[PDB]
Amino acid sequence: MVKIRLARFGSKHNPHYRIVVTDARRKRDGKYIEKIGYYDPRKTTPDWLKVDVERARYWLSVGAQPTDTARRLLRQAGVFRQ
Amino acid sequence: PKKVLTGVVVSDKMQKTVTVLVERQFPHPLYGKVIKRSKKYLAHDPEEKYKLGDVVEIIESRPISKRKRFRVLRLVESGRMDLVEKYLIRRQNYESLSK
Amino acid sequence: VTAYIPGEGHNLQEHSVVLIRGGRVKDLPGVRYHIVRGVYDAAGVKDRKKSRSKYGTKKPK
Amino acid sequence: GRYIGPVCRLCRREGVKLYLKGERCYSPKCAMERRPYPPGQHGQKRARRPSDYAVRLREKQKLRRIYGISERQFRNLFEEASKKKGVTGSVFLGLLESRLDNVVYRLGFAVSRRQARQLVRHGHITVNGRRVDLPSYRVRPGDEIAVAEKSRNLELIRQNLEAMKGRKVGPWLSLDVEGMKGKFLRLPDREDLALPVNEQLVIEFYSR
Amino acid sequence: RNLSALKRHRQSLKRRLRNKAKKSAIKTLSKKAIQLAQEGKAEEALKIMRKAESLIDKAAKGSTLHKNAAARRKSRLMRKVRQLLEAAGAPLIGGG
RNA sequence: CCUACGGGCAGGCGCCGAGGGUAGGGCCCGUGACUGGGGCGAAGUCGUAACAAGGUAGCUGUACCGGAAGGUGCGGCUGGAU
RNA sequence: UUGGAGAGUUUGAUCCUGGCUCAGGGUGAACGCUGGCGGCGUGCCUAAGACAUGCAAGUCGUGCGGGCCGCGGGUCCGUGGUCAGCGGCGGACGGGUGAGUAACGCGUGGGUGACCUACCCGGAAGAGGGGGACAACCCGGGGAAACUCGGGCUAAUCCCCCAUGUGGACCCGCCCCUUGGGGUGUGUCCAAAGGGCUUUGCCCGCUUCCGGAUGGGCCCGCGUCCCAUCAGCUAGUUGGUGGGGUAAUGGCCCACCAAGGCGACGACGGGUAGCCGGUCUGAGAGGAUGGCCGGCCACAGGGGCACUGAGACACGGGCCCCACUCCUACGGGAGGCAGCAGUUAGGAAUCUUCCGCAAUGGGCGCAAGCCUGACGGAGCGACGCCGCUUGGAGGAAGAAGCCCUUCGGGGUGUAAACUCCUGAACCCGGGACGAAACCCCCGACGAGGGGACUGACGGUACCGGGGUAAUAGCGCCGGCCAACUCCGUGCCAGCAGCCGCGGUAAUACGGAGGGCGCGAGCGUUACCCGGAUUCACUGGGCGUAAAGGGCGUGUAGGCGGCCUGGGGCGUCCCAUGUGA
Ligand code: SF4
Ligand SMILES: [Mg+2]
Ligand SMILES: [Mg+2]
Ligand SMILES: [Mg+2]
Ligand SMILES: [Mg+2]
Ligand SMILES: [Mg+2]
Ligand SMILES: [Mg+2]
Ligand SMILES: [Mg+2]
Ligand SMILES: [Mg+2]
Ligand SMILES: [Mg+2]
Ligand SMILES: [Mg+2]
Ligand SMILES: [Mg+2]
Ligand SMILES: [Mg+2]
Ligand SMILES: [Mg+2]
Ligand SMILES: [Mg+2]
Ligand SMILES: [Mg+2]
Ligand SMILES: [Mg+2]
Ligand SMILES: [Mg+2]
Ligand SMILES: [Mg+2]
Ligand SMILES: [Mg+2]
Ligand SMILES: [Mg+2]
Ligand SMILES: [Mg+2]
Ligand SMILES: [Mg+2]
Ligand SMILES: [Mg+2]
Ligand SMILES: [Mg+2]
Ligand SMILES: [Mg+2]
Ligand SMILES: [Mg+2]
Ligand SMILES: [Mg+2]
Ligand SMILES: [Mg+2]
Ligand SMILES: [Mg+2]
Ligand SMILES: [Mg+2]
Ligand SMILES: [Mg+2]
Ligand SMILES: [Mg+2]
Ligand SMILES: [Mg+2]
Ligand SMILES: [Mg+2]
Ligand SMILES: [Mg+2]
Ligand SMILES: [Mg+2]
Ligand SMILES: [Mg+2]
Ligand SMILES: [Mg+2]
Ligand SMILES: [Mg+2]
Ligand SMILES: [Mg+2]
Ligand SMILES: [Mg+2]
Ligand SMILES: [Mg+2]
Ligand SMILES: [Mg+2]
Ligand SMILES: [Mg+2]
Ligand SMILES: [Mg+2]
Ligand SMILES: [Mg+2]
Ligand SMILES: [Mg+2]
Ligand SMILES: [Mg+2]
Ligand SMILES: [Mg+2]
Ligand SMILES: [Mg+2]
Ligand SMILES: [Mg+2]
Ligand SMILES: [Mg+2]
Ligand SMILES: [Mg+2]
Ligand SMILES: [Mg+2]
Ligand SMILES: [Mg+2]
Ligand SMILES: [Mg+2]
Ligand SMILES: [Mg+2]
Ligand SMILES: [Mg+2]
Ligand SMILES: [Mg+2]
Ligand SMILES: [Mg+2]
Ligand SMILES: [Mg+2]
Ligand SMILES: [Mg+2]
Ligand SMILES: [Mg+2]
Ligand SMILES: [Mg+2]
Ligand SMILES: [Mg+2]
Ligand SMILES: [Mg+2]
Ligand SMILES: [Mg+2]
Ligand SMILES: [Mg+2]
Ligand SMILES: [Mg+2]
Ligand SMILES: [Mg+2]
Ligand SMILES: [Mg+2]
Ligand SMILES: [Mg+2]
Ligand SMILES: [Mg+2]
Ligand SMILES: [Mg+2]
Ligand SMILES: [Mg+2]
Ligand SMILES: [Mg+2]
Ligand SMILES: [Mg+2]
Ligand SMILES: [Mg+2]
Ligand SMILES: [Mg+2]
Ligand SMILES: [Mg+2]
Ligand SMILES: [Mg+2]
Ligand SMILES: [Mg+2]
Ligand SMILES: [Mg+2]
Ligand SMILES: [Mg+2]
Ligand SMILES: [Mg+2]
Ligand SMILES: [Mg+2]
Ligand SMILES: [Mg+2]
Ligand SMILES: [Mg+2]
Ligand SMILES: [Mg+2]
Ligand SMILES: [Mg+2]
Ligand SMILES: [Mg+2]
Ligand SMILES: [Mg+2]
Ligand SMILES: [Mg+2]
Ligand SMILES: [Mg+2]
Ligand SMILES: [Mg+2]
Ligand SMILES: [Mg+2]
Ligand SMILES: [Mg+2]
Ligand SMILES: [Mg+2]
Ligand SMILES: [Mg+2]
Ligand SMILES: [Mg+2]
Ligand SMILES: [Mg+2]
Ligand SMILES: [Mg+2]
Ligand SMILES: [Mg+2]
Ligand SMILES: [Mg+2]
Ligand SMILES: [Mg+2]
Ligand SMILES: [Mg+2]
Ligand SMILES: [Mg+2]
Ligand SMILES: [Mg+2]
Ligand SMILES: [Mg+2]
Ligand SMILES: [Mg+2]
Ligand SMILES: [Mg+2]
Ligand SMILES: [Mg+2]
Ligand SMILES: [Mg+2]
């Protein structure tokens, strides 16, 4: 399928994910279809998560499936509150 | 779009095919000047209706044969044998360039 | 090829294994490369004090 | 590491008194006051006309030796200036100044920059709260450059702070003395310090 | 020194067999049909032609023939049957 | 042999085919008794052709000659002193 | 308008020309002398030479039937596990390397009415009745092993037939369309698989079809290195008809027909090279370059081939030829590190046979969970950049030693000594972020709320407390170019990037003192750009410096007078898409 997940950027002991819609079989840090927000697990900032919720639902509509730990950072971003 | 080009038929000697000589100007990347380059296309003529002299349009088309990727769009103008002779002599002129 | 042996006095003989580097000797035509002292069977200059890295000579106490 | 060697000779070569020593610099025991001629066996000789190259070297070394800074870190700063907006000398001087260790000695907590580092280093300084033991820290407008509380009560800093009650220091700076805290209010206009150095010349040394 | 990559292979052998088999079958029948319609013999060619068309399409179902192939195999089949019969005529079945 | 029997599988023949072999060519690199000049050295031998009217103005294309630089013919150029 | 420096050297002297040379930046570097720390990078550029051992791709009992062991305990049935098998889906991703390739390979923009797409999503319909095989297992024969042949048994989501036909496929006709696009009428043809629980209902599954999305296949325009001392190339060649083949166009393949296609706008040939995003340099224009990261391509010991499949002509799948290698019981058989480590060879030279699935991501699975040398980290290497250290304040008209000395003194030098202040290291205690999902609860398995588990790195970072004055090296000092004196040597030994130094007063050799430049680094060699307006578009030239063709005639080509009009190709403007 086409998927929705965490493409690590940043650097050693400095994680910094981009949440991306990528082709399931792309490499993790690879060419993505579209960037839709980021995420910093170390939490060291005002906003360590923005999530284009309008987009994230498009992809969700049109088929995409998020990871486990990407579903949450979309729950946490209120993408499911109906 | 399907690329369309404009050129002269310089060879009718194939069956259901003609050679259309497209030209272009484009200024030279470094030296500035506008310069000319031309190219031959094997163009598809299902009705063997185009002739020498015929200045025509051809269109990027689904592949007909190895080397024919264009069908002749429309006649634009007949009788520019003055062109055919341009090319033709250049070709002829080559016999002298051997050793 | 043929290579210059820099420094005062050398322990080089036939069969001595040697490392070379670029750089001629203006005055010896044909010598266009230099032997690196202190590498393989070419030893450094015993007793240099000044500019030693260039003559492969270790530092004295 | 940094320069860490005979330090009087620097002035003696550079021809001017650079106040690298803190206290001694004002006594007539100061190297310069006793011998105002260059280091070594040949200082006493009738010096020859210095080449344009000579000229600009010394002038840079001067400006450098002043902050006792490594040629790299010096160069980078110059480069940081050459990129940056405005007039290069300003920004070079300006940037140079915003180095904590300097900013520590500026607000006087130390007698030498050379001593001010050791402080900055050994953790005895801080900025807007948190401790900062890196001398290269780029101090920026707004910063509160306290003394480490657990260093307020120290002989070496006691002495230094006290000779600072009524000292006027920098149109670009402030000092709640006695509380041992200061403020970086702005990067200097050139006016704001008159270090014995034509910094235009430094630009020119690098543009070679 | 091993795998169930072998397993995956063992199957290929057997699957292969099924394919090749069903595939030749087509050719025999399909062409037998083109044969008849040549010497047509109209009615029969159409009888056979169907038993082809079913097998062609029954391949189509699985991993044997691809869909468009069955389609391809079909188009060319019918055209041959018809145009052959059309040089004598006429059909005693369909289609069509 | 299966039957699923107007069929399938085995199996047989053919095309093409990795390559192998036979023959003959094209290019390129390496090398070779011997050989031709070339650069360099220089501390030698022979003369002194060119730079002065360079001691026969010089240079020249060509041809013939001579230990060597060179010479001479024929024509040309002045980039020749007087 | 954020951008532009030059110098040495042809002479007795000059100006000009012109080459050589240096200072600048750079690197996957390597060599020397020296070497304390930390972080982030980075590290076989050579033999796409050869490789021992291990490890790199599997998983599902919620598809099926069995074997061995065990927990329930009346041959049996349950439950668990475990071993293979049959059946799945994965294995075509991920990882590696740069051999080949001057090509639609790549880049850029486009075409596809000539196309495909597993798992995902949306939606329309649906799953009735039979029938059969093959392993595992049992039985025999072969071997040292690799294993294997024969015979009989049986389940299934394995196979096959009939039925149903929303639908879809195909021939013919017709309407819209206009390359094979969409609709339709007649004929014809094709579907299916069950499993589990809480068992009048869910859920994972299965089937035909439409659309989406996603990844592709194929096609065309423009760009893409050196040699013309490679000038002529071409028989599947170029076009056509018919077929075969494919997902699909196509001489991709075949038969026949025609005589065509290509080339100085450089065909053909030879040489070199994976291409771009970028990178280095440069005032810019340019030049150079493709390591790391990202995108595409190509290969998987050398070759050919196809099988299975949605997709491979498949690195750790198959067949066959070659080459090498091993194994052994001498009969026979086994291998493919350009995966991670690692060995060897080669080389100037490039690392641990580490740790873990905690994260992230991938495969299977309802889930639990299993696998994951992808990956997260750790290890080694000053390889690069960056940060930190070897202390700080005081301290003589100034010790000893050593250097010079006009013999009075000058120098190293506040340097040392010595004084006090701090406190890298080490000791001690505390000790993370990275981890909240999957799950369980309630809600409805949704929204939502609630609870819980889990850390390789790592007892590390860092917080706190106690605490020691604690590594310096290297180049250079004639001019360019910043830094000068003694001694020894005597055209020797040696130096040398260029000019040039040495023939007993050498700032140029060697040591010394002193000095300049950098500093856990400094220097060297190699290469790239720069200086080089020294291939000159920007931005050069040709009387004598290098350079006008011996002169005509002329093909192609480049260029072209005054006026008016059409077109609007160059050119110019705006919008818009693309420029990851
Ligand atoms: S004393 Fe005079 S010379 Fe010595 S350091 Fe202080 S100022 Fe410079
Ligand atoms: Mg055709
Ligand atoms: Mg020996
Ligand atoms: Mg050199
Ligand atoms: Mg030297
Ligand atoms: Mg000052
Ligand atoms: Mg000052
Ligand atoms: Mg000046
Ligand atoms: Mg500026
Ligand atoms: Mg399996
Ligand atoms: Mg048959
Ligand atoms: Mg198939
Ligand atoms: Mg199919
Ligand atoms: Mg057969
Ligand atoms: Mg053959
Ligand atoms: Mg052959
Ligand atoms: Mg053979
Ligand atoms: Mg010879
Ligand atoms: Mg010879
Ligand atoms: Mg003469
Ligand atoms: Mg004479
Ligand atoms: Mg004479
Ligand atoms: Mg003559
Ligand atoms: Mg004689
Ligand atoms: Mg004679
Ligand atoms: Mg004449
Ligand atoms: Mg400008
Ligand atoms: Mg310059
Ligand atoms: Mg000279
Ligand atoms: Mg001269
Ligand atoms: Mg001279
Ligand atoms: Mg010059
Ligand atoms: Mg510069
Ligand atoms: Mg350099
Ligand atoms: Mg080294
Ligand atoms: Mg060492
Ligand atoms: Mg390699
Ligand atoms: Mg080899
Ligand atoms: Mg070998
Ligand atoms: Mg394992
Ligand atoms: Mg299931
Ligand atoms: Mg299990
Ligand atoms: Mg199993
Ligand atoms: Mg594989
Ligand atoms: Mg792969
Ligand atoms: Mg890959
Ligand atoms: Mg390559
Ligand atoms: Mg080629
Ligand atoms: Mg192209
Ligand atoms: Mg393209
Ligand atoms: Mg059944
Ligand atoms: Mg049964
Ligand atoms: Mg049916
Ligand atoms: Mg055709
Ligand atoms: Mg295929
Ligand atoms: Mg062909
Ligand atoms: Mg043929
Ligand atoms: Mg062309
Ligand atoms: Mg050319
Ligand atoms: Mg090659
Ligand atoms: Mg290559
Ligand atoms: Mg330039
Ligand atoms: Mg240039
Ligand atoms: Mg390249
Ligand atoms: Mg490289
Ligand atoms: Mg790459
Ligand atoms: Mg190959
Ligand atoms: Mg190999
Ligand atoms: Mg092979
Ligand atoms: Mg192969
Ligand atoms: Mg499959
Ligand atoms: Mg293979
Ligand atoms: Mg492949
Ligand atoms: Mg392998
Ligand atoms: Mg073996
Ligand atoms: Mg045996
Ligand atoms: Mg065998
Ligand atoms: Mg092996
Ligand atoms: Mg190794
Ligand atoms: Mg080795
Ligand atoms: Mg070796
Ligand atoms: Mg590594
Ligand atoms: Mg995991
Ligand atoms: Mg996971
Ligand atoms: Mg799943
Ligand atoms: Mg495993
Ligand atoms: Mg492991
Ligand atoms: Mg790693
Ligand atoms: Mg005194
Ligand atoms: Mg003194
Ligand atoms: Mg003394
Ligand atoms: Mg004295
Ligand atoms: Mg001191
Ligand atoms: Mg945590
Ligand atoms: Mg130096
Ligand atoms: Mg310099
Ligand atoms: Mg000087
Ligand atoms: Mg001697
Ligand atoms: Mg002397
Ligand atoms: Mg020197
Ligand atoms: Mg000397
Ligand atoms: Mg450093
Ligand atoms: Mg270096
Ligand atoms: Mg250069
Ligand atoms: Mg020009
Ligand atoms: Mg010139
Ligand atoms: Mg003339
Ligand atoms: Mg003329
Ligand atoms: Mg003309
Ligand atoms: Mg014209
Ligand atoms: Mg005009
Ligand atoms: Mg006009
Ligand atoms: Mg226009
Ligand atoms: Mg644009």
CSV table of C-alpha atoms (C1' of nucleotides) in Angstrom, one decimal, chain D residues 1-5 68-70 73 99 101 112-123 133 135, chain G residues 34-37 382 387-393 415-417 420-425 467-473 518-522:
chain,number,residue,atom,x,y,z
D,1,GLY,CA,45.6,25.3,23.2
D,2,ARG,CA,45.5,29.2,23.1
D,3,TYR,CA,48.7,31.3,23.4
D,4,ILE,CA,49.8,30.5,27.0
D,5,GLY,CA,53.4,31.6,27.0
D,68,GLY,CA,44.7,35.8,22.8
D,69,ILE,CA,42.6,33.8,20.2
D,70,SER,CA,43.6,31.0,17.8
D,73,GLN,CA,38.7,31.1,15.4
D,99,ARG,CA,32.8,36.4,22.9
D,101,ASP,CA,35.3,35.3,27.8
D,112,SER,CA,42.9,39.8,32.1
D,113,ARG,CA,40.9,38.2,29.4
D,114,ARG,CA,43.4,35.5,29.9
D,115,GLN,CA,42.2,35.2,33.5
D,116,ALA,CA,38.6,35.7,32.5
D,117,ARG,CA,38.7,32.5,30.4
D,118,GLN,CA,40.0,30.4,33.3
D,119,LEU,CA,36.9,31.7,35.1
D,120,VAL,CA,34.5,31.1,32.2
D,121,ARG,CA,36.2,27.8,31.9
D,122,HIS,CA,36.2,26.6,35.5
D,123,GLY,CA,32.4,27.3,35.6
D,133,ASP,CA,31.8,27.1,30.6
D,135,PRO,CA,34.8,30.7,26.3
G,34,U,C1',54.8,14.9,17.1
G,35,G,C1',50.5,13.8,19.5
G,36,G,C1',45.8,15.0,25.7
G,37,C,C1',40.3,15.4,25.4
G,382,A,C1',43.8,13.7,14.4
G,387,G,C1',34.5,22.9,20.8
G,388,C,C1',38.0,22.2,25.4
G,389,U,C1',43.0,21.4,28.0
G,390,U,C1',48.2,21.7,29.5
G,391,G,C1',46.5,27.0,34.0
G,392,G,C1',45.5,32.1,36.4
G,393,A,C1',47.2,36.7,39.4
G,415,A,C1',60.5,33.8,31.3
G,416,A,C1',62.2,30.8,35.7
G,417,A,C1',62.5,30.4,40.9
G,420,C,C1',48.8,33.1,46.5
G,421,C,C1',43.6,32.0,43.7
G,422,U,C1',41.1,28.4,40.6
G,423,G,C1',40.6,23.0,39.9
G,424,A,C1',41.2,18.9,33.3
G,425,A,C1',41.8,14.8,35.4
G,467,G,C1',40.1,16.8,44.5
G,468,U,C1',45.4,17.0,41.7
G,469,A,C1',49.2,22.7,38.4
G,470,A,C1',48.3,18.8,35.1
G,471,U,C1',50.9,16.7,27.2
G,472,A,C1',54.0,20.4,22.9
G,473,G,C1',54.8,20.0,18.6
G,518,C,C1',50.6,28.2,13.2
G,519,G,C1',49.4,24.9,17.5
G,520,A,C1',47.2,18.6,18.9
G,521,G,C1',48.6,19.6,15.6
G,522,C,C1',52.5,21.3,11.9
